[PDB]
Subunit: 131 residues, 3 copies
Amino acid sequence: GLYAEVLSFYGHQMQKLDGRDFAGYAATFTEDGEFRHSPLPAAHTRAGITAVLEDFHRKFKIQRRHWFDHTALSQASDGSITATSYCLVLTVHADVKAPEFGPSCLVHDVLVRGADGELLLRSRHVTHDHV
Amino acid sequence: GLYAEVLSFYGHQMQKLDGRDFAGYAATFTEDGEFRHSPLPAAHTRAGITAVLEDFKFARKIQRRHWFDHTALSQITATSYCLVLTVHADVKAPEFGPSCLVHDVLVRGADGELLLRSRHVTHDHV
Amino acid sequence: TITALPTGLYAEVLSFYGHQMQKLDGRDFAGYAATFTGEFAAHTRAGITAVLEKIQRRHWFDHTALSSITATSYCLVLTVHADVKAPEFGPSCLVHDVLVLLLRSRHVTHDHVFP
């Protein structure tokens, strides 16, 4: 049940990000949420995560898609859920049917539960397979 | 439990489509099932969906794969990413495209099976 | 429906694949072979490990379909070269598995190889 719940969490989360719902995407993080886009320092809090998303977005006629695969879960000692997933970024250009691909990434997530049973992302660290 | 069942539903459904089992694929729709390949009039009923698939360029040298990702269910309405792969004989690297959004409406069958009332596909490059 | 398999088993298979492929792609060839009981043709874990023996590969899976449990999945291999952001793709494969979670056999066919 937990595995399907995390996949569903990721499904809604990524569709917000790719739909330019940067505030909704940040809302899936804890309020002290930690996000490292690349090995620039990590962004902190939802407002910080939102700012980082806008800035890396200005470079983008463009429709981005963040595909996930092979999510692997494990329980930490503090009740947190460690998640590691593959991610492949698609960049779709207007009137060009073939997307261009890259980067291929590893997504290191720390998930938490809480009083109301809902999951939230404490931290996300993204590494690039070509780096 | 429903989320895993929908992923399972898509796994069998897409493998039918990619295996050129167009009638089996249409059988995953309701009787009045509706399919819209792009914003082209939409096909109606199993025969209409099957006919549309038969008509639409390719088996001696082409193998297609319709990958799904990030299924999100809501209220059953389903939206998933889709990426089409075109594999050519003796060519290891597939051709990619289009990248699509799959807007689905899921309902409960009489046998208790899942079925698609409607499927609307949009293309990310349009 | 009455012939459907439990949904918990389906998620368990996806999780099984998630841990399994990450070991393989991390060049943990013994850990990957440890997910077999098994034939791959190579036989037993020691034979599988030996056969497996700059570049970072990723084996993506999709559309797992279950039916001993017979499993068939799509697989797409990514080859990522150092300092090159766009991966190289291929082959696209079908993964035929028999689950008892552990594998006796994995039969991989290539979509670009026609009869």
